[PDB]
Every structure is written in structure tokens, then in C-alpha cells.
Write an enzyme that holds these catalytic residues in place. Sequence first.
Site, PDB file in Angstrom:
ATOM      1  N   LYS A  55      48.478  45.076  62.326  1.00 29.06           N
ATOM      2  CA  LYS A  55      49.404  43.986  62.559  1.00 29.06           C
ATOM      3  C   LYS A  55      50.854  44.526  62.556  1.00 29.06           C
ATOM      4  O   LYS A  55      51.765  43.880  63.057  1.00 29.06           O
ATOM      5  CB  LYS A  55      49.215  42.966  61.448  1.00 29.06           C
ATOM      6  CG  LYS A  55      47.907  42.044  61.585  1.00 29.06           C
ATOM      7  N   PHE A 115      47.496  57.103  56.555  1.00 25.62           N
ATOM      8  CA  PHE A 115      47.042  58.082  55.576  1.00 25.62           C
ATOM      9  C   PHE A 115      46.164  57.439  54.544  1.00 25.62           C
ATOM     10  O   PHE A 115      45.015  57.857  54.297  1.00 25.62           O
ATOM     11  CB  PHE A 115      48.299  58.717  54.964  1.00 25.62           C
ATOM     12  CG  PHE A 115      48.121  59.379  53.654  1.00 25.62           C
ATOM     13  CD1 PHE A 115      47.077  60.317  53.413  1.00 25.62           C
ATOM     14  CD2 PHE A 115      49.079  59.186  52.642  1.00 25.62           C
ATOM     15  CE1 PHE A 115      47.018  60.956  52.163  1.00 25.62           C
ATOM     16  CE2 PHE A 115      48.989  59.830  51.392  1.00 25.62           C
ATOM     17  CZ  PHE A 115      47.992  60.708  51.156  1.00 25.62           C
ATOM     18  N   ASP A 161      41.001  55.932  52.042  1.00 29.62           N
ATOM     19  CA  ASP A 161      40.371  54.837  51.337  1.00 29.62           C
ATOM     20  C   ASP A 161      38.992  54.496  51.931  1.00 29.62           C
ATOM     21  O   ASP A 161      38.032  54.185  51.190  1.00 29.62           O
ATOM     22  CB  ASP A 161      41.300  53.642  51.328  1.00 29.62           C
ATOM     23  CG  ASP A 161      40.717  52.466  50.604  1.00 29.62           C
ATOM     24  OD1 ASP A 161      40.363  51.457  51.296  1.00 29.62           O
ATOM     25  OD2 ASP A 161      40.667  52.467  49.324  1.00 29.62           O
ATOM     26  N   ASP A 213      35.668  54.300  49.805  1.00 27.97           N
ATOM     27  CA  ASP A 213      35.032  52.993  49.670  1.00 27.97           C
ATOM     28  C   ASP A 213      33.721  52.869  50.472  1.00 27.97           C
ATOM     29  O   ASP A 213      33.074  51.792  50.429  1.00 27.97           O
ATOM     30  CB  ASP A 213      36.009  51.857  50.027  1.00 27.97           C
ATOM     31  CG  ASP A 213      37.093  51.696  49.025  1.00 27.97           C
ATOM     32  OD1 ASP A 213      37.030  52.305  47.902  1.00 27.97           O
ATOM     33  OD2 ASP A 213      38.112  51.037  49.340  1.00 27.97           O
ATOM     34  N   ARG A 264      37.153  49.402  60.528  1.00 35.21           N
ATOM     35  CA  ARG A 264      38.535  49.149  60.230  1.00 35.21           C
ATOM     36  C   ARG A 264      39.288  48.814  61.505  1.00 35.21           C
ATOM     37  O   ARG A 264      39.097  49.498  62.524  1.00 35.21           O
ATOM     38  CB  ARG A 264      39.128  50.455  59.614  1.00 35.21           C
ATOM     39  CG  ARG A 264      40.643  50.573  59.537  1.00 35.21           C
ATOM     40  CD  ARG A 264      41.253  49.768  58.390  1.00 35.21           C
ATOM     41  NE  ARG A 264      40.811  50.263  57.073  1.00 35.21           N
ATOM     42  CZ  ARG A 264      41.160  49.672  55.948  1.00 35.21           C
ATOM     43  NH1 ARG A 264      41.969  48.617  56.010  1.00 35.21           N
ATOM     44  NH2 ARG A 264      40.722  50.066  54.786  1.00 35.21           N
ATOM     45  N   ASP A 277      41.961  51.782  40.285  1.00 32.37           N
ATOM     46  CA  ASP A 277      40.958  51.053  41.071  1.00 32.37           C
ATOM     47  C   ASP A 277      39.615  51.798  40.903  1.00 32.37           C
ATOM     48  O   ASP A 277      38.584  51.190  40.616  1.00 32.37           O
ATOM     49  CB  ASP A 277      41.399  50.957  42.514  1.00 32.37           C
ATOM     50  CG  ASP A 277      40.379  50.353  43.462  1.00 32.37           C
ATOM     51  OD1 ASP A 277      40.654  49.271  43.971  1.00 32.37           O
ATOM     52  OD2 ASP A 277      39.408  51.035  43.865  1.00 32.37           O
ATOM     53  N   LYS A 283      48.520  49.833  43.299  1.00 33.34           N
ATOM     54  CA  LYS A 283      47.874  50.226  44.550  1.00 33.34           C
ATOM     55  C   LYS A 283      48.378  49.603  45.810  1.00 33.34           C
ATOM     56  O   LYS A 283      48.251  50.227  46.857  1.00 33.34           O
ATOM     57  CB  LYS A 283      46.337  50.089  44.472  1.00 33.34           C
ATOM     58  CG  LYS A 283      45.759  48.746  44.713  1.00 33.34           C
ATOM     59  CD  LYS A 283      44.255  48.849  45.029  1.00 33.34           C
ATOM     60  CE  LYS A 283      43.697  47.406  45.203  1.00 33.34           C
ATOM     61  NZ  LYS A 283      42.209  47.429  45.578  1.00 33.34           N
ATOM     62  N   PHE A 302      49.396  39.259  48.068  1.00 31.20           N
ATOM     63  CA  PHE A 302      48.797  39.886  49.225  1.00 31.20           C
ATOM     64  C   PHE A 302      47.437  40.530  48.880  1.00 31.20           C
ATOM     65  O   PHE A 302      46.451  40.428  49.665  1.00 31.20           O
ATOM     66  CB  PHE A 302      49.773  40.902  49.837  1.00 31.20           C
ATOM     67  CG  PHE A 302      49.198  41.625  51.003  1.00 31.20           C
ATOM     68  CD1 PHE A 302      48.572  42.854  50.846  1.00 31.20           C
ATOM     69  CD2 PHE A 302      49.383  41.124  52.276  1.00 31.20           C
ATOM     70  CE1 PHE A 302      48.012  43.522  51.928  1.00 31.20           C
ATOM     71  CE2 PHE A 302      48.867  41.830  53.422  1.00 31.20           C
ATOM     72  CZ  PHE A 302      48.164  43.032  53.231  1.00 31.20           C
ATOM     73  N   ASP A 328      43.767  39.756  50.123  1.00 29.75           N
ATOM     74  CA  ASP A 328      42.909  40.799  50.666  1.00 29.75           C
ATOM     75  C   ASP A 328      41.508  40.768  50.024  1.00 29.75           C
ATOM     76  O   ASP A 328      40.499  40.936  50.703  1.00 29.75           O
ATOM     77  CB  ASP A 328      43.582  42.187  50.470  1.00 29.75           C
ATOM     78  CG  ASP A 328      42.753  43.304  51.084  1.00 29.75           C
ATOM     79  OD1 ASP A 328      42.642  43.401  52.340  1.00 29.75           O
ATOM     80  OD2 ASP A 328      42.111  44.062  50.316  1.00 29.75           O
ATOM     81  N   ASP A 329      41.439  40.542  48.721  1.00 32.97           N
ATOM     82  CA  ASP A 329      40.169  40.521  48.030  1.00 32.97           C
ATOM     83  C   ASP A 329      39.344  39.270  48.446  1.00 32.97           C
ATOM     84  O   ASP A 329      38.147  39.341  48.684  1.00 32.97           O
ATOM     85  CB  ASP A 329      40.373  40.465  46.537  1.00 32.97           C
ATOM     86  CG  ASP A 329      40.978  41.747  45.925  1.00 32.97           C
ATOM     87  OD1 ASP A 329      41.054  42.789  46.636  1.00 32.97           O
ATOM     88  OD2 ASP A 329      41.340  41.690  44.726  1.00 32.97           O
TER      89      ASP A 329
HETATM   90  C1  YS4 Z   1      45.421  59.649  48.258  1.00 29.54           C
HETATM   91  C2  YS4 Z   1      44.841  58.344  48.847  1.00 29.54           C
HETATM   92  C3  YS4 Z   1      43.426  58.307  48.341  1.00 29.54           C
HETATM   93  O1  YS4 Z   1      45.583  57.408  48.212  1.00 29.54           O
HETATM   94  C4  YS4 Z   1      45.335  56.057  48.543  1.00 29.54           C
HETATM   95  C5  YS4 Z   1      44.516  55.622  49.569  1.00 29.54           C
HETATM   96  C6  YS4 Z   1      44.393  54.212  49.759  1.00 29.54           C
HETATM   97  C7  YS4 Z   1      45.039  53.276  48.946  1.00 29.54           C
HETATM   98  C8  YS4 Z   1      44.905  51.844  49.218  1.00 29.54           C
HETATM   99  C9  YS4 Z   1      45.834  50.950  48.692  1.00 29.54           C
HETATM  100  C10 YS4 Z   1      45.755  49.582  48.879  1.00 29.54           C
HETATM  101  N1  YS4 Z   1      44.746  49.079  49.648  1.00 29.54           N
HETATM  102  C11 YS4 Z   1      43.827  49.932  50.236  1.00 29.54           C
HETATM  103  N2  YS4 Z   1      42.796  49.393  50.926  1.00 29.54           N
HETATM  104  C12 YS4 Z   1      42.244  48.032  50.691  1.00 29.54           C
HETATM  105  P1  YS4 Z   1      41.214  47.658  52.162  1.00 29.54           P
HETATM  106  O2  YS4 Z   1      40.105  48.704  52.323  1.00 29.54           O
HETATM  107  O3  YS4 Z   1      42.096  47.828  53.404  1.00 29.54           O
HETATM  108  O4  YS4 Z   1      40.573  46.271  51.992  1.00 29.54           O
HETATM  109  P2  YS4 Z   1      41.277  48.013  49.151  1.00 29.54           P
HETATM  110  O5  YS4 Z   1      40.292  49.249  49.274  1.00 29.54           O
HETATM  111  O6  YS4 Z   1      42.218  48.330  47.973  1.00 29.54           O
HETATM  112  O7  YS4 Z   1      40.569  46.696  48.887  1.00 29.54           O
HETATM  113  C13 YS4 Z   1      43.883  51.323  49.988  1.00 29.54           C
HETATM  114  C14 YS4 Z   1      45.772  53.714  47.924  1.00 29.54           C
HETATM  115  C15 YS4 Z   1      45.907  55.100  47.715  1.00 29.54           C
HETATM  116 MG    MG Z   2      39.048  49.850  50.876  1.00 29.95          MG
HETATM  117 MG    MG Z   3      40.232  45.164  50.261  1.00 31.37          MG
HETATM  118 MG    MG Z   4      39.850  50.846  48.003  1.00 30.44          MG
END
Ligand code: YS4
Ligand code: MG
Ligand code: MG
Ligand code: MG
Lengths: 346, 346
Positions: free
Chosen positions: B50, B91, B96, B100, B105, B167, B193, B232, B236-237
Amino acid sequence: DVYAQEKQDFVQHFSQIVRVLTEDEMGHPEIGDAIARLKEVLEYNAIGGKYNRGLTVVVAFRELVEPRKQDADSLQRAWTVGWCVELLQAFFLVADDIMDSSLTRRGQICWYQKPGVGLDAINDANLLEACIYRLLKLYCREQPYYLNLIELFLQSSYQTEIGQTLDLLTAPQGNVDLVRFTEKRYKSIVKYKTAFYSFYLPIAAAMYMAGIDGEKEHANAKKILLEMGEFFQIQDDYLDLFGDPSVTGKIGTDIQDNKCSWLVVQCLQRATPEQYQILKENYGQKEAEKVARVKALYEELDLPAVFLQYEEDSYSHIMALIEQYAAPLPPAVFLGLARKIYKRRK
Amino acid sequence: DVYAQEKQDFVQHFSQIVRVLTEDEMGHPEIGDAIARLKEVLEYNAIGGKYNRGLTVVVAFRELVEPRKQDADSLQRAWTVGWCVELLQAFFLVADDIMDSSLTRRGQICWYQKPGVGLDAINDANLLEACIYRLLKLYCREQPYYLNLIELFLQSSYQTEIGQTLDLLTAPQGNVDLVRFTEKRYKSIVKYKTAFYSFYLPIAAAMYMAGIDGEKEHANAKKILLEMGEFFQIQDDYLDLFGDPSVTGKIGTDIQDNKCSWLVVQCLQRATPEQYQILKENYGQKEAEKVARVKALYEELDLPAVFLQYEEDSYSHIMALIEQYAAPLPPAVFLGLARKIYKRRK
Ligand SMILES: CC(C)Oc1ccc(-c2ccnc(NC(P(=O)(O)O)P(=O)(O)O)c2)cc1
Ligand SMILES: [Mg+2]
Ligand SMILES: [Mg+2]
Ligand SMILES: [Mg+2]
Ligand SMILES: CC(C)Oc1ccc(-c2ccnc(NC(P(=O)(O)O)P(=O)(O)O)c2)cc1
Ligand SMILES: [Mg+2]
Ligand SMILES: [Mg+2]
Ligand SMILES: [Mg+2]
């Protein structure tokens, strides 16, 4: 001998590094658990190596700064910047070991292979990288070379990652890649993946800290150092297969991982067509018997002896570069590094 | 409406970002293949979102800088810094998605799931991070706020990684983690985060670029922005499970991944002992029927309706914070961000 002299002092300062990097647990207790994790990651992954890259910062600083300017605070900044280089190495190795499917490192199971760590080590690795810039802020922010150091570390990281890109592109899993394994490609990969951060970075950092910021002095230093880095990576590739693992602390995966190693390049230059075919059918595959066949081929082609000769000729070439390019820096700065790396078994 | 006005211009500048980041293929051709890889990584992973975070830089810069100071070169720096925030997001998301175990995506298969990419995406992710600092150098190095921007991006990265640590620590695979899922823990995780890099960073960057460097102005902005970031992440959750995947572009993995989601926290606060047990036996596991049972529990406990009420109360609270802390910045700076995030379905 100059490295051995500084080593104990250098390692003793790790406690202080860890203490300073975990000290926000005091003011922001909500991040306590994360800081405890970071401490575990630092203890596991930043210790147990030889500390050559970080010690090079400290040895060079001693040799480049007038002794009347080596006050307590300046020396502490130097040990801290050395530790920054070690943290960069630790970031890199944690991530590399994932990407390379490695089993051991520095004498223990790789961090990502530990039960309960796994791909969370991606984040751990990146945390190590962040610690560099926190240390630079905490210790060097009021110094005239602060920005030069930040930019040097960022640039070194970029160059290293570009090299790592070439390394992974040249070594696709599941595809015969022999046609890509040339000396020219090899030289480009190792210049970027190893030589900048392992040799240029630590000496450059010391140079900046000593007030030596000139483009020409940095370029001349680079001429020596990048060639030293090439040799270092050739050695590393030789040791991946032929090194004693009780010494090297890590199991080799270059053959299984389809890598553009110096070994496979030298093999290709010497191989008969029948040998070429043996290489093609056995390289880049996880089967132990196929890895064994490649090693047997390398030994058939006397590659250990070609390495020993290469080490001799490389040493002479680097020494010639020192004669040409050291000035006006003390030649001992480069000579102490050459002594450390040549005839290295680890 | 202010975001829509700037969006086309902003996306059009991606071509120039890519061109500038791939332009060393000219002077160092040996890294050609790596630069081609970086272009593929940028095209796949920095586009299709977005652009809220990057656009926030550009909207804020327009609103904070006197229009007679918005010359061509200044605006280009602003679009470039916006793209830097987008590269940081890229990045993060690449790494992530690995951590995860995600599948899609932004409407396509995650980059690491692509055949032939795999764990090489670790390096790709880090390359995206390096591009930030290359862009800052190339465009902003002669500006008085250069160091402030470098430090802001480095600090934001560290804070974000600390959050990611919390997390992952709170969500160990294969272990019942319900006792850890508290509101207090939740708030700490999302502050680190998500809130720093998604809300504080882009506005702070614009502030620095406008010459607004004061500690108090940055602190007051932060008070609004961190609370906006909390909302936010709650959104997202909620959307991870209840969002329409044709809208969100990504399949939810929070339940399977044992996460401290706002949903599971709210569930725990409301659950009877029998429901507690259903949650315990079904959370944090890959079985689709177990994921289904948790969702059915959340719906039984009217969590969607609790979310809708929470969104209303949160919106009012953030608006009260704007009334308190916006000054002396234009309230439109914060109001345009609130409009963008509240009632968001993606
Ligand atoms: C070095 C790298 C691993 O660092 C990071 C990589 C990703 C993130 C991060 C931060 C905030 N949101 C995301 N993604 C969301 P999303 O997967 O987009 O729903 P979340 O997994 O937290 O629910 C990732 C934070 C740090
Ligand atoms: Mg994620
Ligand atoms: Mg999420
Ligand atoms: Mg995550
Ligand atoms: C972002 C992260 C993936 O970037 C890097 C991670 C690691 C490296 C790197 C550079 C030089 N040597 C290593 N490791 C050696 P080693 O595993 O120690 O024998 P190599 O795998 O090249 O043979 C890793 C370079 C970049
Ligand atoms: Mg390796
Ligand atoms: Mg490797
Ligand atoms: Mg190796």
C-alpha cells in the site's frame, strides 16, 4: 607474536561489551527477555574464534597512533571497534551457516541447529549486526571519525552481501554448475565476500581512528589487503576439505553445496575429459559417497601440492605488494597480518 | 485523500530507485549478476503493498516544509527517504515470512517459497537493508540531517529486531505458551516490533528533513505515533484470522505459529475454564482442524465485536492524543495518518 600479546586483553574486554549491550534492561525492563536472548546469542556466537579480524584493529591502532595519544579512553575505543568487527563476523557466520546447511562452527553445533533456535537465528544474526552501530554510538559518537566508521561498516556489509550473492548465484542447488566455475569468477566472488570485510575493514577502521583518512592512503592499503583476502579465502576453501576438523572447528560443505571453491576451479583446469565427467556426476550432491569421489579426484590431481605451491607464490606476491604499497604506514602493520594468515591450519 | 494525491508520483519514482541502485553494474561489471539479483529482489518484494509508510514520509515532508523550500532536489530526497522506509519494510517482511512459515504476501507466494530461492532469501533480505544506506549516502550525504537519518534508521532497526525477539520468545514452537499471553506483554511486543518503524520512523524522518530536530518535538510526536502503532498491530492481528485474504494479500499463521496475538489475549481474558482448555489443546499447532477450533472459540466469545468496539475506543484515544501533543506541528500530519489506518480492511 604482536597478536598473542594483545589477545588476552582483547578477550577480557568482551565482558564489558556484553555488559554495555545488555545495560538497557535497567531502564526499559519490558525488553528484559530480549536482552537475555541477545546475551545468549553474543556468548554463543562472538566467542571461540581466533579473533584475528578484531585483534587486527587493536594491533593496527597501536602501530598507527603515536604512543602519547594512546590514552585509556582511546584504547578502549580501539578494543570496542575490534569487537564491532567480531560482531560483524558473528552476524555473517550465523546467517551463512543457515544458508550453507552447515553442522558445526568453532567446535560446537551451529547456533541455528540448536534445538529450539532454528530459523529464529535469522533474527539473532541481525541483532548482532545492530550491536555494531549501538557500540559505535556509545563509544565513538563525539569523535571526528564517527561518520567514517559508520559508513565503512555499512559499506563493508554491502560489499560482503554482494559477494555472498555471487557465491549463491554461482552455486545453485540441484543444478550442474561446472561451466560457471572459472578463475575470473572465483576472484570476483572472494574479493567481495571475504576480502573487504576480513582485511580492508579492520585496518581501515584503525586508519580512520588514527586520523588517516586520505583516499590515496586507503587505496594503497586496499591493494595489499584485498590480495591478502583472496589468499585467505583460497586457504579457507582448501581447509574446508583438507583441514583437520579438530583444528578448523567446522565440517566442510563446499562439495555438497555446489560451491565455486578454489579446489573445484583448480580441478577443472587440470581434469581429463574422463575426470571432468567424474566431477560432473559427483559434485553438488549430498551423498557421502559422491563427496568422497570428488575428494579422491582432487587428491589424484595432487591438489594439496598445488595448494602448497600456491601458498608459497601468494606469500611472495603479497610481500612484494607490501614493499610497493605499505609506505608511509609501518610495514609491520601488514607484516604482522601476513604472519598470522600464512601457514594457518585454522 | 492526501495519500492518494501523492501515490502515483511516489510509485513512479521506484524506476529511478532501481536505476540508481543497479547503476554500479556500469563501473564494476564483475558484480553484474549480483546486481541483476538485487533488481529481481527489489521488483518482487518492494512493490505491491500500500506504501503507507513511505508515503507518510512524503506527505509529512510536504506538510512540514515551507512550500518555497520544496525545490525539485528536496522533493526527490523526500521520495527517496520514503522509499528507504519501504526498503526497510521489505527487508523485514522477507525475513519475517521465513521465520513465520508464511505462504503468501501482497497477493503472491512469499519470496522464500519460490522454487530456487529458499534460504538464500536471508541474504536477499539483508541486501534490501543495505540499499537503504546506499540511498541515504547517494542523496542526502551533504545535508545537515544526514547523520540524524542514518541513526534513526539504525535505531529503528534495532528496536524492531528487539520486538521481533520478544515476539519469537513468547511464541516457542511446540510449547503451550498461554501463560505468557498477557496484555502487558502484548503491548511491549507491538511497541517494539511495529510501532517504532511503522509510525515513528517515517514521521521522524520528515521532521529531521524539515529541520525539526528537537528532543521535545520528537517525544511529543512519539506519544501519538506509538499509540497509533499499537492500534495498527492489533488490527493486523485481527485481520490475520478475520481479514479477507483477497484484500489482505496474505494467509494468516498466528494460531499455528503460537503467537501472542491480540486475539488470543482477548480470548484468555474472557474464557471459561472449559474454553481455556479448548484453547490449550488447539493453539500453536499446524493441524487445520485445530486452527478451526480456535477460530470457532473466538467467534463464540464475540471477538469480532470486541475488536470493532476496540477500534472505536482506540480511534477516540488517538484523536485525544493528537489534540494534546500535535502542537506545534500541523494536526493534519497526524490526522491524515489516522484516516489511512482506521477502518482499514488491509
Ligand atoms: C531481522 C528481521 C528478522 O527483523 C524483523 C523482521 C520482521 C519484523 C516484523 C515486524 C512487524 N510485523 C511483521 N510482520 C507481521 P505480518 O507477517 O506482515 O502479519 P507479524 O509477523 O508481526 O504478525 C514483521 C520485525 C523484525
Ligand atoms: Mg509474519
Ligand atoms: Mg500479522
Ligand atoms: Mg512475525
Ligand atoms: C546477510 C548475510 C547473509 O551476509 C553474509 C553472510 C556470510 C558471509 C560470509 C562471507 C565470507 N565467508 C563466509 N563463510 C565461509 P565459512 O562457512 O566460514 O567456511 P564460506 O561459506 O564463504 O566458505 C560467510 C557473507 C555475507
Ligand atoms: Mg559457509
Ligand atoms: Mg557460504
Ligand atoms: Mg568456507
